[PDB]
Amino acid sequence: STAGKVIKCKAAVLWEEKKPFSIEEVEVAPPKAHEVRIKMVATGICRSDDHVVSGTLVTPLPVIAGHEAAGIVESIGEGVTTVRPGDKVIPLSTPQCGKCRVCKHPEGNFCLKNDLSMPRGTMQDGTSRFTCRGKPIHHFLGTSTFSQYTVVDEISVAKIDAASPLEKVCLIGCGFSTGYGSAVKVAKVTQGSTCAVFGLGGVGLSVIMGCKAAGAARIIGVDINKDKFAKAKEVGATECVNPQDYKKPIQEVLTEMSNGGVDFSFEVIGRLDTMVTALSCCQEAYGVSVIVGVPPDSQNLSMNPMLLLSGRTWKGAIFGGFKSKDSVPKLVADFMAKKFALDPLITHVLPFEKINEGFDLLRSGESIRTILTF
Amino acid sequence: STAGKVIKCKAAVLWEEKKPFSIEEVEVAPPKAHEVRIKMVATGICRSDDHVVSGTLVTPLPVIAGHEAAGIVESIGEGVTTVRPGDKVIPLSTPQCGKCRVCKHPEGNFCLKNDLSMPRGTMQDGTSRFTCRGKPIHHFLGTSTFSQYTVVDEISVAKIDAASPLEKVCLIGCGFSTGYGSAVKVAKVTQGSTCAVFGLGGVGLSVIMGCKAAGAARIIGVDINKDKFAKAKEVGATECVNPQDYKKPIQEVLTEMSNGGVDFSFEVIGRLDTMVTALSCCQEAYGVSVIVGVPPDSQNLSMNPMLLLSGRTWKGAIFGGFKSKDSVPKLVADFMAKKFALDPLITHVLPFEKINEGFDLLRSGESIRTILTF
Ligand SMILES: NC(=O)C1=CN([C@@H]2O[C@H](COP(=O)(O)OP(=O)(O)OC[C@H]3O[C@@H](n4cnc5c(N)ncnc54)[C@H](O)[C@@H]3O)[C@@H](O)[C@H]2O)C=CC1
Ligand SMILES: NC(=O)C1=CN([C@@H]2O[C@H](COP(=O)(O)OP(=O)(O)OC[C@H]3O[C@@H](n4cnc5c(N)ncnc54)[C@H](O)[C@@H]3O)[C@@H](O)[C@H]2O)C=CC1
Numbered sequence: 178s179t180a181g182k183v184i185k186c187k188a189a190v191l192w193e194e195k196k197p198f199s200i201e202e203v204e205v206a207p208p209k210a211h212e213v214r215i216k217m218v219a220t221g222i223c224r225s226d227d228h229v230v231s232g233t234l235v236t237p238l239p240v241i242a243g244h245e246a247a248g249i250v251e252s253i254g255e256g257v258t259t260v261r262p263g264d265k266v267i268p269l270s271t272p273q274c275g276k277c278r279v280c281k282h283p284e285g286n287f288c289l290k291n292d293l294s295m296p297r298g299t300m301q302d303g304t305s306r307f308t309c310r311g312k313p314i315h316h317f318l319g320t321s322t323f324s325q326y327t328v329v330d331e332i333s334v335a336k337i338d339a340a341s342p343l344e345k346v347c348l349i350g351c352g353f354s355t356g357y358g359s360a361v362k363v364a365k366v367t368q369g370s371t372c373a374v375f376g377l378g379g380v381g382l383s384v385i386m387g388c389k390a391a392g393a394a395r396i397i398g399v400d401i402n403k404d405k406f407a408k409a410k411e412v413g414a415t416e417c418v419n420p421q422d423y424k425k426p427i428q429e430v431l432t433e434m435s436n437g438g439v440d441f442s443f444e445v446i447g448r449l450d451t452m453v454t455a456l457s458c459c460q461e462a463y464g465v466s467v468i469v470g471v472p473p474d475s476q477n478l479s480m481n482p483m484l485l486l487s488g489r490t491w492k493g494a495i496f497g498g499f500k501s502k503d504s505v506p507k508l509v510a511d512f513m514a515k516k517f518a519l520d521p522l523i524t525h526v527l528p529f530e531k532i533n534e535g536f537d538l539l540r541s542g543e544s545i546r547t548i549l550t551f
Numbered sequence: 552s553t554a555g556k557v558i559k560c561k562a563a564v565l566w567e568e569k570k571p572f573s574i575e576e577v578e579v580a581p582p583k584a585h586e587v588r589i590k591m592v593a594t595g596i597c598r599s600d601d602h603v604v605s606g607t608l609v610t611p612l613p614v615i616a617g618h619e620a621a622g623i624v625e626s627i628g629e630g631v632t633t634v635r636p637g638d639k640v641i642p643l644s645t646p647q648c649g650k651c652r653v654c655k656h657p658e659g660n661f662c663l664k665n666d667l668s669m670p671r672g673t674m675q676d677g678t679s680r681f682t683c684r685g686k687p688i689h690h691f692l693g694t695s696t697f698s699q700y701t702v703v704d705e706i707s708v709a710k711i712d713a714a715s716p717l718e719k720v721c722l723i724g725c726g727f728s729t730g731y732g733s734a735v736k737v738a739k740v741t742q743g744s745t746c747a748v749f750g751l752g753g754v755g756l757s758v759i760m761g762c763k764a765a766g767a768a769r770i771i772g773v774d775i776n777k778d779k780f781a782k783a784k785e786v787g788a789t790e791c792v793n794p795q796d797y798k799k800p801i802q803e804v805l806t807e808m809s810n811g812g813v814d815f816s817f818e819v820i821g822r823l824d825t826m827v828t829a830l831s832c833c834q835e836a837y838g839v840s841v842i843v844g845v846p847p848d849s850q851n852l853s854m855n856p857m858l859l860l861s862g863r864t865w866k867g868a869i870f871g872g873f874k875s876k877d878s879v880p881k882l883v884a885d886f887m888a889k890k891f892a893l894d895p896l897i898t899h900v901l902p903f904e905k906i907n908e909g910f911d912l913l914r915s916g917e918s919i920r921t922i923l924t925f
């Protein structure tokens with residue numbers, strides 16, 4: 178009934194920074210060659226979507242944001258081989274083209290077809306499939322999931338188990354896999370180690386899950402919102418500290434608590450000062466610190482390179498280091514085999530129409546992940 | 552005939568920054584418990600010794616500098632078990648106490664007994680073994696090798712092969728092992744990779760030797776002094792670039808030459824700007840950059856953390872990551888078995904009394920390593 182034909186549907190449009198999302202009708206074009214049109218079933222609210230609203234992350238406006246989601250293929254364009262109508266799918270904000278130097282490298286995952294380094298807010302072909310009030314609307318990270326339907330390039334979608342619960346596994350499309358992989362793949366946390374996790378939102382709790390799965394002996398959660406300590410302990414934190422409770426800098430607190438520095442630290446907030454504090458609190462000769470949080474646009478940090486010369490390792494990653502199209506179906510299979518839990522991340526489930534309330538919940542500190550259901 | 556007695560001998564004393572060394576008589580106390588007094592045979596001039604003169608590297612003055620050297624044990628204090636009078640030895644500017652958390656860690660080498668982080672310029676017991684003009688003189692990094700005799704703690708000396716040529720193997724005490732290990736141990740350069748080495752002095756040439764030993768396919772040397780290129784190519788560089796020859800920043804040049812970024816880069820100069828350029832020229836998703844050069848005291852660099860978030864790894868190390876007392880005798884053994892060459896690093900030889908001419912040669916750009924003979 179809809180294949181080959183323009184779909185009119187509801188979406189949340191962001192016309193301008195620092196405004197509520199506008200829920201209104203949009204026009205979704207049919208998929209061109211190597212494109213996939215998806216009916217959305219559930220989408221999570223990730224802090225990166227809020228960074229578009231706040232100006233922290235710059236991408237062309239107006240835009241349909243949303244990138245952490247799951248849905249069902251409505252139709253495919255000519256030449257698509259990896260998904261078919263009716264398949265359950267997760268869109269991928271980091272593509273996996275399989276052909277570039279990064280996709281061919283055993284470790285790398287930041288495929289050169291990504292829309293993050295030089296954001297265009299289009300399909301791979303440089304055009305948009307969305308119109309609203311007769312105006313073309315930009316895409317976001319090749320995903321755009323705050324819409325009843327979206328169109329994505331084939332390299333930005335993964336087919337998943339037909340029995341998957343989409344209102345939970347949408348988190349594997351971004352926040353869970355990012356945090357979990359940051360611990361198990363990027364840092365390679367070791368049995369018996371001491372970890373410090375700065376930021377106890379959805380991504381930080383997923384880092385804690387990964388540190389616990391790797392056998393860390395101590396996992397210290399750090400957040401300025403003490404309401405986020407109870408859930409952090411439930412998922413594996415052994416202690417939590419609030420920087421605002423201390424007269425001294427938290428890096429010195431954490432160094433003393435760890436008898437000279439932690440083995441692994443994670444910055445899962447997106448602040449320059451906490452990136453430098455997280456580096457400093459890892460042990461100077463052999464510690465490893467991983468940046469996960471998104472820094473504010475165009476701002477540089479300042480640090481003393483003696484922190485590195487003594488032997489620290491500093492790294493960052495997108496999407497937990499996972500090659501996205503290969504890994505997402507495997508992570509869904511692991512969840513269905515009960516290898517990890519997603520329910521601890523989900524504090525609110527709301528109809529899509531309540532998107533702005535979901536963002537208010539995030540900004541107020543009250544939620545971890547809100548899942549929006551279509 | 553000197554055991555247990557004060558030795559009067561010549562040393563090069565640095566009374567003030569930015570002044571020539573003063574070659575004059577000092578008094579060297581006999582070794583206390585767990586200390587070793589060494590008759591110096593040869594010492595190299597490492598840029599780090601010049602950094603003390605320039606104030607780039609802050610350590611208490613007045614001081615006996617020098618740290619890359621080899622000599623013969625004159626006497627041992629009570630309790631010394633790892634060397635005996637007559638043994639050939641190399642002093643270690645990074646100790647290996649064997650008892651701290653770093654010494655016990657499989658990767659770490661920056662032993663907590665070091666005198667680098669919070670310099671005191673003393674023996675481990677907090678006192679000095681040197682007097683000059685009746686005044687106490689500081690030690691440097693627990694070594695102080697610009698003297699006919701020095702006293703070191705047992706944890707800062709390694710026994711080496713009795714047949715070793717001391718006028719060559721002194722370089723294993725600092726510059727050779729630092730560069731070589733930075734490639735083979737810290738970066739873990741892989742076969743077929745592309746490497747970029749910033750700074751083609753003694754340490755950078757040793758990085759090139761390590762990259763070649765690791766089987767790198769391309770090794771790009773970077774220096775603003777084109778007179779350094781011929782020797783860089785002799786030891787393994789496949790190509791050399793002078794940043795001053797180009798209209799665009801060298802990170803852009805290197806990214807284009809490597810078809811999107813190098814696999815491994817090394818900063819082996821000691822400038823904040825080149826630390827950031829070297830990080831930037833490694834491939835954004837899977838590149839690794841190692842800081843080897845010493846930054847000017849207490850200065851911070853400025854960088855955009857998106858360079859790390861895409862996937863880069865940034866690390867530094869002291870002494871090529873080698874656990875010093877374990878590794879130095881094995882590296883001497885490997886040298887004696889012809890596994891690496893030191894002659895390419897030695898461009899000038901001088902008697903110790905011409906130390907100031909040796910520093911002039913380094914500062915003018917003319918030398919790689921000058922070896923001083925006592
Ligand atoms: N690298 C990647 O691939 C990904 C990066 N991100 C970024 O990770 C970050 C975290 O995302 P979420 O967990 O969704 O965000 P969130 O907002 O739910 O969690 C952030 C936590 O940081 C705490 N916090 C804020 N300022 C703090 C401070 N000075 N000190 C200590 N804690 C502080 C907050 O109270 C909150 O609990 C964001 O910057 C997000 O954009 C998210 C997913 C993918
Ligand atoms: N991490 C460690 O354990 C060690 C660190 N060091 C440090 O490594 C560094 C190199 O030491 P050496 O090889 O002895 O010094 P060196 O002075 O012989 O070599 C440095 C090279 O950098 C070149 N250079 C200077 N400015 C440059 C610029 N803007 N761009 C490109 N090239 C430039 C110079 O022309 C020179 O050839 C020094 O900072 C030294 O203190 C040395 C030994 C141990």
Ligand SMILES: O=CNC1CCCCC1
Nearest residue numbers: 223225234270351471495
């Ligand atoms: O949350 C999804 N993607 C993020 C990844 C880090 C940079 C900003 C966008």
Ligand SMILES: O=CNC1CCCCC1
Nearest residue numbers: 597599608644725845869
């Ligand atoms: O050259 C020898 N040691 C150096 C190591 C890096 C910091 C300054 C001292």
Ligand SMILES: [Zn+2]
Nearest residue numbers: 274277280288
């Ligand atoms: Zn790719």
Ligand SMILES: [Zn+2]
Nearest residue numbers: 223225351352
């Ligand atoms: Zn996200």
Ligand SMILES: [Zn+2]
Nearest residue numbers: 648651654662
């Ligand atoms: Zn030690």
Ligand SMILES: [Zn+2]
Nearest residue numbers: 597599725726
């Ligand atoms: Zn040195």
